[PDB]
């Protein structure tokens, strides 16, 4: 805890030539100074994607433990913060994709993942596996899809995983394909490029995942779904 | 359309590619470095270590080790202490 | 009379200058290293979002760091005791003279108040004649270009 | 302020010039403002009704976006120009019932459907759910 | 200041430290010194 | 279980006990490639053992690509002779196998989602980063890459016993998550 | 550049030659031969003969020629 | 003091041999011969880059390779130089590359 | 075609050496003589220290020594190899195949090891 000297008022406060004789001194500890900078970076990343403050608070707590544990001392602080931010989103039940975290961070996706693994090891903690429904609300909302389409996409992805029609596929790829299937079955139709941009998945990956679930399209769709485009006439590709 | 998910930033892959393409500086033989080191001294009487590395294009540790044997550090209060390429 | 518009514009000029200042600083580090810079990562959205919010949230006018010279009382919690009270709070006028300072002349009912300011509505106590309310039809020019 | 001052301030800002060799120029062209929006913890945006902000202690602010043109001179007699359309630069609190307010242009019946008093004159800001009025 | 004396730092360095010590000590008693900077609470609020 | 993992790659390091001139080796060695800017070692390949070895100026050499313990030692000795044939006093000192890589298939799909839940302490499944589950066995220090297709890759073993022992431990676990 | 760099190689070659045990003095031209400085400029030769080889504290002028200074150094 | 690649070729060998004949006759000092070779390398290197605008393709099997000081010494066996206009067959070829 | 390219090379070579021949003070007649000659010429082992236990583990070393076969000299833009094959992005260069000289600008080559 410290006090900062205020600005000079009278002539006595100023040296013989202009500059104030009493100047603030950097007395902050190096460990605290780096930690302070990390929290500033954490807040900056969160605002880019409008993360709630509670997630930021969890992220700040995670970094302090990681920073104190010093298992990741060799890695850049920004990467740790970016990885810590990713873990906080998972811990709070609103996971963000590594690409989404990278979009708001100068650190690349690969480094974030590497730090993410180390932080879990250092903290002796675990994160629940991501499901296709963990991204439907954000992906559909960003695509400006109605609630009915979002519900259909959520049901399609959940049913497809349960039916094991996309074994080994990344949950994001399955969700993007499910959104595309639901989007093409409603008035609001979105292209693969459109869904890929928000979902962060290449249109080719959406095409592959969609092709796997297309054969059983009627089964995956909700029973009480109003098909603007009939399931039979859904795109085949 | 802002902060779209991306695996790696475009500015970052270009920098990574340039670093990979350029490659790490190699440790050349002492004689060649010495010959190039003294040729540089001809152009300018005084050289900065950071700028001197670019001319030699040698690892900093290797350059310092060779420069330490013959080169000496002269303390200048105006800016900072720099290296002297004159053996004496 | 400085209204929210001129008031907010003054704040935005500083925040935007700060926004560009950090944008220049962030870009300077990356360009110095020889690598291109991501424009999105250079922008700190907290500068404008929080700066505007803090000034309105607390009423301290200016910067939180420079609260010493910041004008206080500019922003107040809207009074919901009565609809007339709510209306009056939205038509209130604050005199430049500090409330602590005492001077009759600024507190006096000047002749120029006719038709512009209510001659009767004014608080009793240290704020007599300093806090005022607009006349019923009185309007404040929003300003325009003289070109 | 929103319609003119914000654009004027952004336009009046000198272009940012970087030189440290490649030279980078940044110019802010246009200002875009959206409806007062709230983001759920999952990241889904949604319009923020004034009543919701009061109850949930939110700040009635509209996302702010700006068009930025990035031109780089690499000393090779080649100029590359790229524009980052609608670059988010922060959020501006919105005076209620103003031209950019959600309640703007809503009939008395519409305001009732939004749990908003038609007689309410607006003219104030909701910061963290607190109705704030800027005193002249 | 004690470390600088033990470390034998430069006289001007010690003089600056003495200046700060005099300021802090003086403002520990009276923070309303005329024509002198005020001691803020890291948030712009002068110390009491 | 009836399934024995088959080694795919073995990494063995042997010290030649003498400093070597990397530039000279590259000029005279048949298949050596030396790029000091890229890497500080000399990379050489011999087709018949089908292995690749890296040679450092310190005299220590690393041999990789061998499919068996005998092949690794034989390949390492052949590399040492090549250096010895170049006029250096290369020897075969403290030869050791540093890593053994084995692969096998369980012949049935695996529900990785269930496996991580029951073995979160050892499992690490991140579809975003890698499509295969990473299992870190403790009793043997072996890292296993389990995939939905059933393919299992074992690595980090110092002896062939660990590779077989590790698979024997994980196989019953995989059988409990058969898809 | 020119006029200031060839001298360093002469000194370094001189130092290395002394380490071999060759205490005998060496002429300016002779030292230039082994340092690949046969193209050394004329005005550089006189400068070395007048300033560099006398001002330096490690150069001894013996019978006209120049030799190392191990006596000053502790051996 | 240059790249010095085409010296060990038919064009390079002829130039080197010619300089030797003049040297034996004392017509040219040895220093001049080195300068002539140096200038030729600059001209040939620039000549190939600018006045050559034809693409070629080839396939084969590699028997040996080397690398040192950014110089490759590939050794290909049974190479099939295939071009749009003609196809050329060779039992063995050595490809030396530099940069 | 190739002979025409060779003739152009001669013009560049003679022109590029004119300045040098003036610097050293040698008579210009040398260049004329050089061209004439140049044209004519063209047209259980527990104790493992001993490595002698293995022999004939190499191949003939005269492949590089002879160099009488066709030799190709060029420049490389990219050279990639993936565990079996070597890929060559060789740029402008020269080739000596069966005496005949071949010239190319872009070369693509895949080889098997």
GROMACS .gro file of N, CA and C in nm, chain F residues 5-59:
model
  165
  661UNK      N    1   0.116  -5.458  -2.844
  661UNK     CA    2   0.158  -5.340  -2.921
  661UNK      C    3   0.285  -5.367  -3.000
  662UNK      N    4   0.291  -5.310  -3.120
  662UNK     CA    5   0.407  -5.322  -3.208
  662UNK      C    6   0.479  -5.188  -3.212
  663UNK      N    7   0.610  -5.192  -3.188
  663UNK     CA    8   0.689  -5.069  -3.182
  663UNK      C    9   0.694  -5.002  -3.319
  664UNK      N   10   0.672  -4.871  -3.320
  664UNK     CA   11   0.678  -4.790  -3.442
  664UNK      C   12   0.802  -4.704  -3.453
  665UNK      N   13   0.864  -4.667  -3.341
  665UNK     CA   14   0.984  -4.585  -3.345
  665UNK      C   15   1.053  -4.591  -3.210
  666UNK      N   16   1.186  -4.600  -3.213
  666UNK     CA   17   1.268  -4.607  -3.093
  666UNK      C   18   1.375  -4.499  -3.103
  667UNK      N   19   1.392  -4.422  -2.996
  667UNK     CA   20   1.492  -4.316  -2.989
  667UNK      C   21   1.600  -4.361  -2.891
  668UNK      N   22   1.723  -4.370  -2.940
  668UNK     CA   23   1.837  -4.412  -2.860
  668UNK      C   24   1.950  -4.313  -2.878
  669UNK      N   25   2.015  -4.278  -2.767
  669UNK     CA   26   2.126  -4.184  -2.767
  669UNK      C   27   2.253  -4.255  -2.723
  670UNK      N   28   2.361  -4.235  -2.797
  670UNK     CA   29   2.490  -4.296  -2.768
  670UNK      C   30   2.597  -4.188  -2.777
  671UNK      N   31   2.692  -4.192  -2.684
  671UNK     CA   32   2.803  -4.098  -2.681
  671UNK      C   33   2.923  -4.160  -2.750
  672UNK      N   34   2.979  -4.088  -2.848
  672UNK     CA   35   3.097  -4.135  -2.919
  672UNK      C   36   3.226  -4.108  -2.842
  673UNK      N   37   3.221  -4.025  -2.738
  673UNK     CA   38   3.338  -4.002  -2.655
  673UNK      C   39   3.446  -3.918  -2.718
  674UNK      N   40   3.413  -3.840  -2.821
  674UNK     CA   41   3.512  -3.756  -2.887
  674UNK      C   42   3.440  -3.642  -2.958
  675UNK      N   43   3.498  -3.522  -2.949
  675UNK     CA   44   3.442  -3.407  -3.019
  675UNK      C   45   3.457  -3.426  -3.169
  676UNK      N   46   3.358  -3.378  -3.244
  676UNK     CA   47   3.353  -3.395  -3.388
  676UNK      C   48   3.338  -3.260  -3.457
  677UNK      N   49   3.393  -3.250  -3.577
  677UNK     CA   50   3.380  -3.132  -3.661
  677UNK      C   51   3.261  -3.152  -3.754
  678UNK      N   52   3.152  -3.080  -3.727
  678UNK     CA   53   3.029  -3.100  -3.802
  678UNK      C   54   3.049  -3.067  -3.950
  679UNK      N   55   3.120  -2.958  -3.979
  679UNK     CA   56   3.140  -2.918  -4.119
  679UNK      C   57   3.213  -3.027  -4.197
  680UNK      N   58   3.317  -3.085  -4.138
  680UNK     CA   59   3.392  -3.189  -4.207
  680UNK      C   60   3.305  -3.311  -4.234
  681UNK      N   61   3.222  -3.350  -4.137
  681UNK     CA   62   3.139  -3.468  -4.154
  681UNK      C   63   3.042  -3.449  -4.270
  682UNK      N   64   2.979  -3.332  -4.279
  682UNK     CA   65   2.882  -3.308  -4.385
  682UNK      C   66   2.946  -3.320  -4.522
  683UNK      N   67   3.068  -3.267  -4.538
  683UNK     CA   68   3.134  -3.271  -4.668
  683UNK      C   69   3.163  -3.414  -4.711
  684UNK      N   70   3.206  -3.499  -4.618
  684UNK     CA   71   3.251  -3.634  -4.652
  684UNK      C   72   3.144  -3.740  -4.632
  685UNK      N   73   3.052  -3.721  -4.538
  685UNK     CA   74   2.949  -3.821  -4.512
  685UNK      C   75   2.855  -3.835  -4.631
  686UNK      N   76   2.809  -3.958  -4.653
  686UNK     CA   77   2.728  -3.986  -4.772
  686UNK      C   78   2.596  -3.911  -4.769
  687UNK      N   79   2.521  -3.924  -4.659
  687UNK     CA   80   2.385  -3.872  -4.650
  687UNK      C   81   2.370  -3.760  -4.548
  688UNK      N   82   2.481  -3.711  -4.492
  688UNK     CA   83   2.472  -3.609  -4.388
  688UNK      C   84   2.428  -3.476  -4.446
  689UNK      N   85   2.347  -3.403  -4.369
  689UNK     CA   86   2.306  -3.267  -4.402
  689UNK      C   87   2.326  -3.180  -4.280
  690UNK      N   88   2.397  -3.068  -4.297
  690UNK     CA   89   2.430  -2.979  -4.187
  690UNK      C   90   2.381  -2.839  -4.221
  691UNK      N   91   2.294  -2.785  -4.136
  691UNK     CA   92   2.239  -2.650  -4.152
  691UNK      C   93   2.249  -2.578  -4.018
  692UNK      N   94   2.364  -2.518  -3.988
  692UNK     CA   95   2.379  -2.454  -3.856
  692UNK      C   96   2.274  -2.347  -3.830
  693UNK      N   97   2.231  -2.274  -3.933
  693UNK     CA   98   2.125  -2.176  -3.914
  693UNK      C   99   1.995  -2.244  -3.870
  694UNK      N  100   1.964  -2.359  -3.928
  694UNK     CA  101   1.842  -2.431  -3.892
  694UNK      C  102   1.861  -2.510  -3.763
  695UNK      N  103   1.956  -2.604  -3.762
  695UNK     CA  104   1.983  -2.686  -3.645
  695UNK      C  105   2.134  -2.698  -3.627
  696UNK      N  106   2.175  -2.720  -3.503
  696UNK     CA  107   2.316  -2.723  -3.467
  696UNK      C  108   2.378  -2.862  -3.480
  697UNK      N  109   2.302  -2.962  -3.524
  697UNK     CA  110   2.351  -3.098  -3.537
  697UNK      C  111   2.362  -3.137  -3.684
  698UNK      N  112   2.414  -3.257  -3.707
  698UNK     CA  113   2.429  -3.314  -3.840
  698UNK      C  114   2.332  -3.431  -3.852
  699UNK      N  115   2.242  -3.422  -3.949
  699UNK     CA  116   2.138  -3.523  -3.970
  699UNK      C  117   2.185  -3.618  -4.078
  700UNK      N  118   2.187  -3.748  -4.047
  700UNK     CA  119   2.229  -3.851  -4.140
  700UNK      C  120   2.125  -3.962  -4.142
  701UNK      N  121   2.112  -4.026  -4.259
  701UNK     CA  122   2.014  -4.132  -4.279
  701UNK      C  123   2.080  -4.251  -4.347
  702UNK      N  124   2.049  -4.370  -4.298
  702UNK     CA  125   2.093  -4.496  -4.358
  702UNK      C  126   1.969  -4.578  -4.391
  703UNK      N  127   1.958  -4.620  -4.517
  703UNK     CA  128   1.832  -4.676  -4.565
  703UNK      C  129   1.808  -4.816  -4.512
  704UNK      N  130   1.911  -4.901  -4.508
  704UNK     CA  131   1.888  -5.041  -4.474
  704UNK      C  132   1.831  -5.058  -4.334
  705UNK      N  133   1.888  -5.000  -4.228
  705UNK     CA  134   1.816  -4.998  -4.100
  705UNK      C  135   1.691  -4.912  -4.103
  706UNK      N  136   1.679  -4.821  -4.199
  706UNK     CA  137   1.567  -4.728  -4.208
  706UNK      C  138   1.555  -4.647  -4.079
  707UNK      N  139   1.660  -4.572  -4.049
  707UNK     CA  140   1.667  -4.490  -3.929
  707UNK      C  141   1.738  -4.360  -3.961
  708UNK      N  142   1.712  -4.259  -3.879
  708UNK     CA  143   1.775  -4.128  -3.890
  708UNK      C  144   1.847  -4.096  -3.760
  709UNK      N  145   1.968  -4.041  -3.772
  709UNK     CA  146   2.051  -4.010  -3.656
  709UNK      C  147   2.101  -3.867  -3.665
  710UNK      N  148   2.111  -3.802  -3.550
  710UNK     CA  149   2.163  -3.666  -3.539
  710UNK      C  150   2.297  -3.670  -3.467
  711UNK      N  151   2.396  -3.601  -3.523
  711UNK     CA  152   2.532  -3.600  -3.470
  711UNK      C  153   2.566  -3.458  -3.427
  712UNK      N  154   2.614  -3.444  -3.304
  712UNK     CA  155   2.652  -3.316  -3.247
  712UNK      C  156   2.804  -3.307  -3.235
  713UNK      N  157   2.853  -3.183  -3.231
  713UNK     CA  158   2.997  -3.161  -3.221
  713UNK      C  159   3.054  -3.219  -3.092
  714UNK      N  160   2.971  -3.232  -2.988
  714UNK     CA  161   3.018  -3.285  -2.861
  714UNK      C  162   3.048  -3.434  -2.866
  715UNK      N  163   3.012  -3.502  -2.975
  715UNK     CA  164   3.032  -3.644  -2.988
  715UNK      C  165   2.911  -3.729  -2.953
   0.00000   0.00000   0.00000
